[PDB]
Write a protein that binds this ligand. Sequence first.
Ligand SMILES: [Cu+2]
Length: 287
Amino acid sequence: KYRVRKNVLHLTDTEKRDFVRTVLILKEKGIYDRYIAWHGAAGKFHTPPGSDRNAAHMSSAFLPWHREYLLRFERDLQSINPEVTLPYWEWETDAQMQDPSQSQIWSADFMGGNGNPIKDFIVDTGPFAAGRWTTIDEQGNPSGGLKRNFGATKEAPTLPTRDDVLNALKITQYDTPPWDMTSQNSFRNQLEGFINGPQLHNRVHRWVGGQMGVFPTAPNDPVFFLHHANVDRIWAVWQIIHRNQNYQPMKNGPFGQNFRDPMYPWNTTPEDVMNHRKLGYVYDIEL
Ligand SMILES: [Cu+2]
């Protein structure tokens, strides 16, 4: 309840400077790379083998897995600078702008901006521009720079809307069998964005493009963490609203997806992270 995660648009100039500074230290120390790797590893861990479900997405663990991922990340930020917490990118409000690409999140003192089409969409502004920030491919090898290409896709020309968010929050069940990308009347599947997709979470990745447009390379872009903090906030809000609902499946789901199953690559279970307040943080909007 002490660590407050703030909306990016509410951050002071120094808060933004301190966050960026801290991420760059995590990168320099070699720590940031662990987060890129863990996310890639989980995505290749299929539950069960042969299924498209994996430890980190396309099934019920999507939400708790990322909650745990962000918790560890924030804890690493805190070790460097105890005043730094993980902010969230409220993309549904950016979606209301005439041009969401004019959002302050993409300023040169924060995330930096869109890709340069002359340079094949390499990002050349901000703290994470090519030449200031190195990237790796799916195999762990150097890839030579962060890329972004906002709204360039036929399937995701726009960010998800406030209405889209409110509509997901109306869903009563956390998830439903068969606990996959086809789950109907499922908050998890709705928020993940598969039904008539891409929507919500899947749509944001596709809208940003570049490394964010493909799962395994997505964390090369620091905005990955800001996006997932927003996803985590939306889940937190669903949890408050639907207080008598709990995680599903409680049992008999594939191993790695049940309430008390360890979430690869860690030993942490969904049960361990069900109460975000117990983990030591809250979102500003709760206060
Ligand atoms: Cu992910």
